[PDB]
Every structure is written in structure tokens, then in C-alpha cells.
């Protein structure tokens, strides 16, 4: 009943902590500084945290920093620029392996749930159009993406590759959750890139980007982590994308939800819209997960943005 959640202050991690606590788990959560109230208050306030949330100090870039915290845990949820190598790739790989090394020496460990990204699966060079169905058999081609300076994609891909290689050689049971853009309600007055993209659309923007991304609800993502951990038969990677939508469609939905809200009518450019495509939901559904529709996620995001004082409509 004891599990560890790294980088507990994160958006996805905070929701995972909330849901784990509600299920009765004892959660050992790590943050860079547990003595900083402004960054742990949203966690301590969660229902059940007072009795079952145990905070520990740990930094991903510090070797062996997670050795003791993972001990005694049956499950470990690892959810935690100029030069892309030293400032992005290197730290991402080091952190992942640092945590995994600690897991390799924990006798009580049963399974590791690693938070990855759709970035590690969709970019292999194949076109992504309306009738194409991307699934877990797709693996991003790092070298290919590097030629386009898609360093965040490269980093996420190399990180997951390294993770799988390590757990196979160290006999560790690991599953990964691979979400796209994550939106939904906020637990604290801080925004992730995804929520920020939505905010930009509703606070006076003259245009919307010519871009199509996969979108998913943070609650669905957190639940997927829990289900992938509890279900013994779960394995491999899990695409967490409710649907892919162009910003024009996101804006259309916003107009439907808020008929009097001023919204951008012009696309950033005059080129054809980046096409949308499909992403398999099969694996996540096989665990019993139900997907929250895009219109609901957008609604929850906007309402939270207002509640947290980011938007005044």
C-alpha cells in the first residue's frame, strides 16, 4: 500500500497523488524542497494527505538521491535552451537512469510506471493524416527528428529508449504512459505548456496557431498510471490521447462553450491546416479507462484558469 511518486509537485504528478491518496495509498512523494510551502501547499491540502502523504527531498540530477525513498515501495511512479545536449538530453537521461538505478536495488519493488510522451512514438517519418492510426508499435526515429532540431522530441525519445533498455537488463517490470497535450482542472495557480496554450486563445489573441496536437485530460492520464500499476497483466507502452485537433477546432469548441467570449478568427498563417490523425485508445481502454471528451477538458481548463485568476472573462 506504499508507493513513491517522484516530482510530486508536477501537474500530472499532483493529480496522481490526489487520486492515489483517495484510493487509500501511503504516498512517498519527492520534491526538490519540501520545506518550501509555496510549492507543496497544493499537495498537503489534498484529501488524506495529512495522514498519508510523506514528503521527501530529492533532486533528479543528484546520483543516489532516490535510493532510500523508493525502498519499502511496491510501486514507483517516475513522473518527474541553448545546447540541446547538455541542457536537455543529458539531464533527461541522467534523471531517468538515476531513479531506475535506485529501483534496481529495491527488493520490495513490483512495478515501475514511467511517464513518457506521445513524442516518443509518433515521429518515425510516416505521414500522420486523418485515416492514419498511430499506436504503440510506432517508435520515434531520434536521428530523423534531430535533423529538424526537434530536440524536445529527441530528448523524450532517447529517455524512453534508455529506460526500456535498462529495465530489460536489470529485470525490472516497467510500463509507460504516453500522453500528448495534457489539459484539465488545475490543482494550483501554475500552468503547464498545454494549459498556457488554451489561456492564450481566450485572453485576447489575434490569431490561433496553424497546428494540430493530440489532447488528453489530466485526470485520465493520472488514472491510467494507477490502472497500469494495479492491473498485473498491463505491459508495454500506453498511448494517452483522446483525440488530435487543430487549433481551429479547439477555437470552434470554445465558441460553442462560451458564446460571448472574444476569440481569434484568423489562423497564424494562410497555409493549409496541419492535418489531424488518429491515436489508438485500445490499450488504455483494455485497463478499463474511460476517456474524457475534448469539449469537457477544454471547459474544465477554462473554468480553472478563471478560478486561478489567470483569465478574466
Swiss-Prot record:
The annotated consequence of residue 213 to A reads: Increase activity with sinapaldehyde as substrate. Strongly increase activity with sinapaldehyde as substrate
**Is Nuclease among the key words of this record?**
no
**What are the binding positions for (E)-coniferaldehyde in this chain?**
117, 123, 128, 152, 181, 194, 213, 244, 277
Which residues take part in binding NADP(+)? 7-13, 32, 39, 59-60, 79-80, 152, 156, 179-182, 194
The entry's localization annotation reads: Cytoplasm
> Could you give a single Gene Ontology term from the biological process aspect?
phenylpropanoid biosynthetic process
- The organism's superkingdom is given as Eukaryota
Catalytic residues (UniProt): 156 (proton donor)
Give coiled-coil spans as residue ranges. Answer: none
* Effect caused by changing residue 152 to A/F: Impaired activity
Q: What is its main location?
A: cytoplasm
InterPro entries xrefs = Epimerase_deHydtase, NAD(P)-bd_dom_sf, NAD(P)_dehydrat-like
**What keywords sit in the KW lines?**
Cytoplasm, NADP, Oxidoreductase
**What does the record give as EC number?**
1.2.1.44
GO cellular component term, pick one: cytoplasm
| Pathway noted in the entry | Aromatic compound metabolism; phenylpropanoid biosynthesis
Q: Which Pfam families match?
A: Epimerase (PF01370)
Which reaction is recorded as catalysed by this protein?
(E)-cinnamaldehyde + NADP(+) + CoA = (E)-cinnamoyl-CoA + NADPH + H(+); (E)-coniferaldehyde + NADP(+) + CoA = (E)-feruloyl-CoA + NADPH + H(+); (E)-4-coumaraldehyde + NADP(+) + CoA = (E)-4-coumaroyl-CoA + NADPH + H(+)
In Gene Ontology terms, what is one molecular function of this protein? oxidoreductase activity, acting on the CH-OH group of donors, NAD or NADP as acceptor
Q: Which PANTHER family match?
A: CINNAMOYL-COA REDUCTASE CAD2, NAD DEPENDENT EPIMERASE/DEHYDRATASE
- Report the family membership: Belongs to the NAD(P)-dependent epimerase/dehydratase family. Dihydroflavonol-4-reductase subfamily.
Say what the protein does. Involved in lignin biosynthesis. Regulates the monolignol composition by catalyzing the conversion of cinnamoyl-CoAs into their corresponding cinnamaldehydes. Can use coumaraldehyde and coniferaldehyde as substrates, but barely sinapaldehyde.
Q: What is this protein called?
A: Cinnamoyl-CoA reductase CAD2
Q: What is the lineage of its organism?
A: Eukaryota, Viridiplantae, Streptophyta, Embryophyta, Tracheophyta
Amino acid at each position: 500500500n506504499v508507493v513513491c511518486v517522484t516530482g510530486a509537485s508536477g501537474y500530472i504528478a499532483s493529480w496522481l497523488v490526489r487520486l492515489l491518496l483517495h484510493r487509500g495509498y501511503t504516498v512517498k512523494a519527492t520534491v526538490r524542497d519540501p520545506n518550501d510551502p509555496k510549492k507543496v501547499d497544493h499537495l498537503v491540502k489534498l484529501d488524506g494527505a495529512k495522514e498519508r502523504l510523506q514528503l521527501f527531498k530529492a533532486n533528479l540530477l543528484e546520483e543516489g538521491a532516490f535510493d532510500s525513498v523508493v525502498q519499502g515501495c511496491h510501486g514507483v511512479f517516475h513522473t518527474a535552451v541553448k545546447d540541446p545536449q547538455a541542457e536537455l538530453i543529458d539531464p533527461a537521461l541522467k534523471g531517468t537512469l538515476n531513479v531506475l538505478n535506485s529501483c534496481a536495488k529495491s527488493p520490495s519493488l513490483k512495478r515501475v510506471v514511467l511517464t513518457s510522451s506521445i513524442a516518443a512514438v509518433a515521429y518515425n517519418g510516416k505521414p500522420r493524416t486523418p485515416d492514419v492510426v498511430v499506436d504503440e508499435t510506432w517508435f520515434t526515429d531520434a536521428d530523423f527528428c534531430a535533423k529538424s532540431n526537434l530536440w524536445y522530441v529527441v530528448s523524450a525519445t532517447l529517455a524512453e529508449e534508455a529506460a526500456w533498455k535498462f529495465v530489460k537488463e536489470n529485470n525490472i517490470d516497467m510500463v509507460t504512459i504516453n500522453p500528448a497535450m495534457v489539459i484539465g482542472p488545475l490543482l494550483q495557480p501554475v500552468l503547464n505548456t498545454s494549459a498556457a496554450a488554451i489561456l492564450n486563445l481566450i485572453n485576447g489573441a489575434q490569431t490561433f496557431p496553424n497546428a494540430s496536437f493530440g489532447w488528453v485530460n489530466v485526470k485520465d492520464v493520472a488514472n491510467a498510471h494507477i490502472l497500469a500499476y494495479e492491473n498485473a497483466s498491463a505491459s508495454g507502452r500506453h498511448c494517452l490521447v483522446e483525440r488530435v485537433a487543430h487549433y481551429s477546432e479547439v477555437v470552434r469548441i470554445l465558441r460553442e462553450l462560451y458564446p460571448s467570449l472574444q476569440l481569434p478568427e484568423k489562423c497564424a498563417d494562410d497555409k493549409p491546416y496541419v492535418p489531424i490523425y488518429q491515436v489508438s485508445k485500445e490499450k488504455a481502454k483494455s485497463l478499463g479507462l474511460e476517456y474524457t471528451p475534448l469539449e469537457v477538458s477544454i471547459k474544465e481548463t477554462v473554468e480553472s484558469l478563471k478560478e486561478k485568476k489567470f483569465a478574466n472573462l
